[PDB]
């Protein structure tokens, strides 16, 4: 919690306030000193001290309820959250990451590891819905904050919790990773809309790792192997070099030295 905190509220959220927020999140995720073919890279986990491993996003809503998500700076993804005197973490994929996560919310007695990881395929199963059937927007994020808040006192069932994680991860982590997805959320906020993400957003989320690898292994930006994505109508298309992604992808996971 001495980790850096970025605050956002859904109470009176605007295009501007959400933009300020996502830009602030990006600026705390990485210094931006490391850029490949114009795209910033997140810090290398190798060489990253534990006291720089995480950032905290404190979310508040119209009900003045507040929860604090923790993001891993190496991949911009949510690893867990605190509400009051309880905190909860996805089951990590390995022992090194699990050890790092013990450095989060250390003043909380009641810390828990969920049975499940935070990958979307499992969260969707637990939520009882796929990402394409879960609405995003200021309303959904407001609801997700309350759901995360009431989970420690028994007021939130697991499916609603998992849904709420899917909402937060996309509107925060994926929006930080992709200006495209930030823009998709800006449009929803602008027109006071809630709607689910279409295949163009889902396939970018799915392919973020693959895109990071393709860009960093490229020859002056030209991909060795095409990366496949989908358009809004679900038709498949291929990306063959970084230039078309410069307006689209804002952050990459570190894969190799420049």
């Amino acid at each position: 919690k001495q980790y850096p905190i970025i605050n956002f509220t859904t109470a009176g959220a605007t295009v501007q306030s959400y933009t300020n927020f996502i830009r602030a999140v990006r600026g705390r995720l990485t210094t931006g000193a490391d850029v490949r073919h114009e795209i910033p890279v997140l810090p290398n986990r190798v060489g990253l001290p534990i006291n720089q491993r995480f950032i905290l996003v404190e979310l508040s809503n119209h009900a003045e309820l507040s929860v604090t998500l923790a993001l891993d700076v190496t991949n911009a993804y949510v690893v867990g959250y605190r509400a009051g005197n309880s905190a909860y973490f996805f089951h990590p994929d390995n022992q090194e990451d699990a050890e790092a996560i013990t450095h989060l919310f250390t003043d909380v007695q009641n810390r828990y590891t969920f049975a499940f990881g935070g990958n979307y395929d499992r969260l969707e199963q637990l939520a009882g819905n796929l990402r394409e059937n879960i609405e995003l927007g200021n309303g959904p994020l407001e609801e997700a904050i309350s759901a995360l808040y009431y989970y420690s006192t028994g007021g939130t069932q697991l499916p609603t919790l998992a849904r709420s994680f899917i909402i937060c991860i996309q509107m925060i982590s994926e929006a930080a990773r992709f200006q495209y997805i930030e823009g998709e959320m800006r449009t929803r906020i602008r027109y006071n809309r809630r709607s689910a993400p279409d295949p163009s957003v889902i396939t970018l989320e799915n392919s973020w790792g693959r895109l990071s690898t393709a860009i960093q292994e490229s020859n002056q930006g030209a991909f060795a192997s095409p990366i496949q994505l989908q358009r809004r109508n679900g038709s498949k298309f291929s990306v063959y070099d970084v230039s078309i992604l410069i307006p689209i992808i804002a952050l990459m996971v570190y894969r190799c030295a420049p």
Partner: nanobody
Amino acid sequence: VQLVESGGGLVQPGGSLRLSCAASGFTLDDYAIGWFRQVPGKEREGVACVKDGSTYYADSVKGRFTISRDNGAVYLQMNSLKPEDTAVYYCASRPCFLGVPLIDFGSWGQGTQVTV
């Protein structure tokens, strides 16, 4: 702490016990749960743990102990008990990996005593 151990006691070698880990206000189904052992003079050792899709055991207890979920609780069925199994047993929500390492959040409760 909310996760409470019960079921400890005295048995002879070859004997059996079933320990329970539960919370009065909520189901443990949503959480990764491990059973850990601490014999006097050392530090807590992973015995068995459960998460989504995986169960792991310490080599010491393979084929003798069983961890399972039922009744919103997590049980440790201990069979063919050896004197080497004597310890205070603790349950907690902790990560579950091969070899049941303890990657500790640091909050524990009273545990339950087992004597063989």
